[PDB]
């Protein structure tokens, strides 16, 4: 309905160049963003109101999770190129934050293959020069908005979304107030 | 040499008489006191490396949160005051990380409501100066350390646990060389 800038979100200083249309960052550790895809859905509701041609990137970042957190960074990286973001995504979360299953890189391994993946073709992903660059692409991306902290949410990599200032008494009205925010920014 | 001081642990320039033998801070407002606690299990880990009569005591603090902040610090101590540690730990830390549903004190009455315990025996140590006493014991704790940051973990009023000298590529790993060294210093 009603926005206000600084209020249901803010603006970048620097706007960020070639930055997706609509961009989010996650890790796989983080206890929010688990929230964010498992009971709220912020990302489908999202998607329902987006506009026509305006496409959703989502990226993870290395910040969390030491050492670890790097390597989740790798293996959304083959998520996307194999295009199993759906397959696998609850399943990483659940390993890291629930079950607690995953400890070390090769557990990872073990989730993508569990979902019918082939290992062969999971190493080869691990190891192409398409997973390097979608590596490195998520730390630009990352840098260039200076993200300090995950979830986030940026529109034309000028605005970025503020939860915060949202109404977060009732949950399904916060859900598709931070939907329409996006939209509304989406076509601004 | 193969543990020194400024590498995995560091000496208080000022030692503290008569401080717990190890010696536990967080605030459940502190992202890697989550993962510390949840993720990691580092407590349970520590608690079952030391020897016999080596008692842990977990202390939260005032600096993070505000107004939220120091009534976790009374609700802490009425955990601790009624001995329902292990029944609230999750719910507080999801509640104020994951959910985000702790907004205020009755947020965190319903936690220990829903957990099974009743409200007139929740009010009632709510205000007691038993907890009250429990409240300064943790202050004057954090104030005899110069704590100024979380998580923190001390041992004989010595040492300062430095967990930024250890690998995070295994997480199990991780775990056990920070349960090691506990071990060492308390009988060191």
Same mark, same amino acid.
């Given at each position: 309905a009603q926005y206000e800038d600084g209020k249901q979100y803010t603006t970048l200083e620097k706007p960020v160049?070639?930055?997706?249309?609509?961009?989010?960052?996650?890790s796989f550790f983080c206890p929010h963003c688990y929230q964010f895809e498992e009971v709220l859905h912020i990302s489908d509701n999202v998607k329902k109101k987006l506009p026509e *041609?305006?496409?959703? !990137?989502?990226?993870?970042?290395?910040? /969390?999770?030491?050492?670890? *957190?790097?390597?989740? !960074?790798?293996?959304?990286?083959?998520? /996307?190129?194999?295009?199993?973001?759906?397959?696998?995504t609850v399943p990483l979360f659940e390993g890291v934050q629930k079950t607690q299953t995953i400890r070390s890189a090769s557990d990872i391994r073990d989730v993508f293959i569990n979902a019918g993946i082939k290992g062969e073709e999971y190493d080869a992903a691990w190891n192409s020069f398409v997973v390097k660059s979608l590596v490195a692409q998520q730390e630009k991306a990352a840098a260039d908005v200076q993200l300090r902290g995950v979830p986030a949410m940026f529109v034309n990599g000028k605005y970025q979304l503020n939860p915060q200032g949202m109404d977060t008494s009732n949950m399904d009205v916060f859900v598709q107030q931070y939907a329409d925010t996006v939209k509304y920014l989406s076509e601004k």
């Open positions: 160049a070639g930055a997706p249309q609509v961009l989010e960052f996650f *041609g305006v496409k959703m !990137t989502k990226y993870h970042v290395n910040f /969390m999770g030491g050492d670890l *957190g790097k390597d989740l !960074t790798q293996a959304w990286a083959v998520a /996307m190129a194999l295009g199993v973001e759906d397959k696998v």
